[PDB]
């Protein structure tokens, strides 16, 4: 059953969790090709592994910048968790290493580009299109949460479309293993649950709220709570009054009212029936959950793939020289990486 799958999944995860892979490649093994994305303290580049000719996305984090932004522990979380998990819709970490200046996470390259890119361009997804992606997040969160993991950064920018049109979740920078509650104010404004904003201490239920935000944004073409500045976004979230496009079906609205539920005793995903309140909701009536996991369902959208290591589905970013100091930086802080 689901329970059986999950029990076995957990056993595999804990082995890697307790004994993480470390220093499994070196910079000189990769040819650097192109920047695919940037973040507050680093960049992700398309690289080619010289000995296999495989393409990977190499996330390069400047140690000194991580330290300045107080993301040391989050960064250690990310690598330790990412190296340990295994789910069809989770991007795979293939290698990790560090040098005098940087940390490196070499991950599977997902050529179809960000959901963000396609969503913005097309405007909004049909309900069946949105339902397809949503189901994959439902299962991914069922998996992560069963491992006591909170993801904490669901948004289209972090969901890549693979060559078969299925989702790959990336960016585990805020992922955290925690039993009970946690308090870090982190995430992206549009997607924060009310309890995060209110410093109430929070749990996995924030991911189910974020799911509510994602489905709304996918189906409407804009998020349920937006403004020009984050503070204004928080005020909208906390009041929690949500208006739905007139094209939203009755089922969709009912599902969203239960996900975008301020009352934790009522928020779907968080009740006695757990994720089943969601899987069995009317909006998902047409969803075959096993077919989704098995990747047997036909994707509403297949990205254009002009060749191996092609980057047409990504935006262009300014390229910077990757410099490595002749002195070790922040060795102690990242000793476990």
């Amino acid at each position: 059953s689901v329970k059986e799958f999950l029990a076995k999944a957990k056993e595999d995860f804990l082995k890697k969790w307790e004994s993480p892979a470390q220093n499994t490649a070196h910079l000189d093994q990769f040819e650097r090709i192109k920047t695919l994305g940037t973040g507050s303290f680093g960049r992700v580049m398309l690289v080619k592994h010289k000995e296999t000719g495989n393409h990977y996305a190499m996330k390069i984090l400047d140690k000194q910048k991580v330290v300045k932004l107080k993301q040391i522990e989050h960064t250690l979380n990310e690598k330790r968790i990412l190296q340990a998990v295994n789910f069809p819709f989770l991007v795979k970490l293939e290698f990790s290493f560090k040098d005098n200046s940087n940390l490196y996470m070499v991950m599977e390259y997902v050529p179809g580009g960000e959901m963000f890119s396609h969503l913005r361009r097309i405007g909004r997804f049909s309900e069946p299109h949105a339902r397809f992606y949503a189901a994959q997040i439902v299962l991914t969160f069922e998996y992560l949460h069963s491992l006591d993991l909170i993801y904490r950064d669901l948004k289209p920018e972090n969901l890549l479309i693979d060559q078969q049109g299925y989702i790959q979740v990336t960016d585990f920078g805020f992922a955290k293993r925690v039993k009970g509650r946690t308090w870090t104010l982190c995430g992206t404004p549009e997607y924060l649950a009310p309890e995060i904003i209110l410093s109430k201490g929070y749990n996995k239920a924030v991911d189910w709220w974020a799911l509510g935000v994602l489905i709304y944004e996918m189906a409407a073409g804009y998020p349920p709570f937006f403004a020009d500045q984050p503070i204004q976004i928080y005020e909208k979230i906390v009041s929690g009054k949500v208006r739905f496009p007139s094209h939203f079906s009755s089922d969709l609205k009912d599902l969203l009212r239960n996900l975008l539920q301020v009352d934790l005793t009522k928020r779907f995903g968080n009740l006695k029936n757990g994720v089943n309140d969601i899987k069995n909701h009317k909006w998902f009536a047409t969803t075959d959950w096993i077919a989704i996991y098995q990747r047997k369902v036909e994707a509403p959208f297949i990205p254009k793939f002009k060749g191996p290591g092609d980057t047409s589905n990504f935006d262009d970013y300014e390229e910077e020289e990757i410099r490595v100091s002749i002195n070790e930086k922040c060795g102690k802080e990242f000793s476990e990486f």
Binding site: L69, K70, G187, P189, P223, F226, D228, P230
Partner: peptide, 19 residues
């Protein structure tokens, strides 16, 4: 329309995480 309001807003680009 709400769509028009969104498109004209400053947050249709990639949204950064907060720390």
């Amino acid at each position: 329309t709400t769509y028009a309001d969104f498109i004209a807003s400053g947050r249709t680009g990639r949204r950064n995480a907060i720390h």
